[PDB]
Nucleic acid binder design. Sequence first.
RNA 1: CUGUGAAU
Lengths: 394, 15
Amino acid sequence: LPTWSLMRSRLSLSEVLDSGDLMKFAVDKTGCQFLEKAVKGSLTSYQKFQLFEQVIGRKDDFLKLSTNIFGNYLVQSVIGISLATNDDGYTKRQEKLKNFISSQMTDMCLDKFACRVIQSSLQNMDLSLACKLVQALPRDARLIAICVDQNANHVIQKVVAVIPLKNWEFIVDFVATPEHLRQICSDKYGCRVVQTIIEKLTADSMNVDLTSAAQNLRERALQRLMTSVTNRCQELATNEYANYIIQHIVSNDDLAVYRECIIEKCLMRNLLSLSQEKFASHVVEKAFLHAPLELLAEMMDEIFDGYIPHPDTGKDALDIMMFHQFGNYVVQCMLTICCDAVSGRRQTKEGGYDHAISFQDWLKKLHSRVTKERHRLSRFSSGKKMIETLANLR
Amino acid sequence: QHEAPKQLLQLRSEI
RNA sequence: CUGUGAAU
């Protein structure tokens, strides 16, 4: 801090602006604190002119402040003041701001503090100029590093949230690339990007405001990404992060058409194996909970009769899953579903059939097995829950 | 990954 | 006998 301002004083904002020492105030813990409160008062036309010039008018100072732990707050304040100042410099300032950020898009996205200037600009700038910010995103392997970056991943999620799909449709096709999808979906942060994109591409209640032409664009982009996801749902469903994406698709009612595809492509004929996986067992749970009835019948038949019992012990698939540290949650799901059906909490009509007689069949199977194994089951918390679930039915 | 080994069973044939 | 996901 300059000595003419000394520790602290009764400083005026015009003093700071006229001194030429704003930069050493904006990077200071106490100085930037004074500026954040000063710019919230009634500024004169010239004081705003000075802030525009000194905070978002010089590229190098704008970059330095945007990447500063404290100065990035001042930049967002001044950007907001500039957007709220409808004078004759309004067009010139927003254009200069877009060019500043676009020229350093990638590095600002990867910066812990500058990525907040990006997100603030994306949601507050006029929609037209914010769209030009998306055009500055990279199209090579730096986009992968952005999607999997601890900071830059929120920039992509912000783009998806506040910018029309026409401007970021290339990200959908970039992520849908099979090689890119593997890296991104298997990342702690890249999996959030992919799930946020899917949610924005879903025709749910948050998208009824779209025009028909925008719905068609949304539908086509969704089909291209769902094709890529379902082409590889086996490695995604077992992955420690990508299993959340497969769960979301299987459990979302507005994505019901992709339920049959996912359940049939990677879940069917693998239920015993996937139910014993730490991550895939959650996907199996969701698949039982939301499967169409005709497909649910096939999943039930696979557990009850899809496997040959062990040739030495006679242990079958239900026995293995029932007492497995992960499979027991799947069997519990099967039992809760059947009890919900026979008691009325779940409807049983589909495709002209009433599957109530089928739910009664599967419940009879699980009740019969829980009865025989009541002593082994009573050792476990999961087993006591299955016994209690059945007793609550009567 | 301190889990018990998977217990796999032979699948019934599909048609 | 309980079992997994974001940066000022």
